[PDB]
Ligand binder design. Structure first.
Ligand code: ZDC
Ligand code: ZDC
Ligand code: CA
Ligand code: CA
Ligand code: CA
Ligand code: CA
Lengths: 114, 114
């Protein structure tokens, strides 16, 4: 099934943050209504924050996360969790190789902000 | 129900990261085996990362997150979610006031690392 796509409420500020856990340099592309609205790039095997940004979901609310490593797309896993009917997390894991730890780039989207 | 307490696999490196969305200064306390292992402090209404660290879960594997503002415990919500039976997120929201957005300090714990 499709992974890394989330429908947010329209015109809502959300946070996006990416962590790296891989010897390969990770490139995280964040799309809002199918246009790139943030890209993060970095390399770390100790969970370093390679990027964090406040974006707006815009009129469509469509947010998509992609991860690639040296040009090659990573396999993604994702889910959205909602706590006390109010606090939202959209979670993404990715695997760039074979060991299947799916932490190579870890992306966390959270809203509402403020 | 108790919130903000997670049992991790023993002796396992994990990342903990906190974001702030409040007029108040957030103080996040991360306890491992009932003893303080990290403390984050900062203020932001635009989701700024007030702290990120790598810790080890140790022998018990017990990790607890606590949040306080102006010396007052914030009310917490939490859950753990596991993707492809491998990638782990322990999630915490907190409310320091009356509006119940529960984003005042947002804490994300993830493992495995590396
Ligand atoms: C390349 O060596 C594979 C790669 O980097 C490792 C350090 C480890 O993080 C692995 O999961 C990642 O796919
Ligand atoms: C105090 O004003 C309450 C407090 O700060 C606000 C800016 C808002 O973030 C609210 O959620 C937080 O509890
Ligand atoms: Ca991997
Ligand atoms: Ca990895
Ligand atoms: Ca609040
Ligand atoms: Ca708030």
């Amino acid at each position: 099934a499709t992974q890394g796509v989330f429908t947010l409420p329209a015109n809502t500020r959300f946070g996006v943050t990416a962590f790296a856990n891989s010897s390969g340099t990770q490139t995280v592309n964040v799309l809002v209504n199918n246009e790139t609205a943030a890209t993060f790039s970095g390399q770390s095997t100790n969970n370093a924050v390679i990027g964090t940004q406040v974006l707006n979901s815009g009129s469509s609310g469509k947010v998509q996360v992609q991860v690639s490593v040296n040009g090659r797309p990573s396999d993604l896993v994702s889910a959205q969790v909602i706590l006390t009917n109010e606090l939202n997390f959209a979670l993404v894991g990715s695997e760039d190789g074979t060991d299947n730890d799916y932490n190579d780039a870890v992306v966390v989207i959270n809203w509402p902000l403020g």
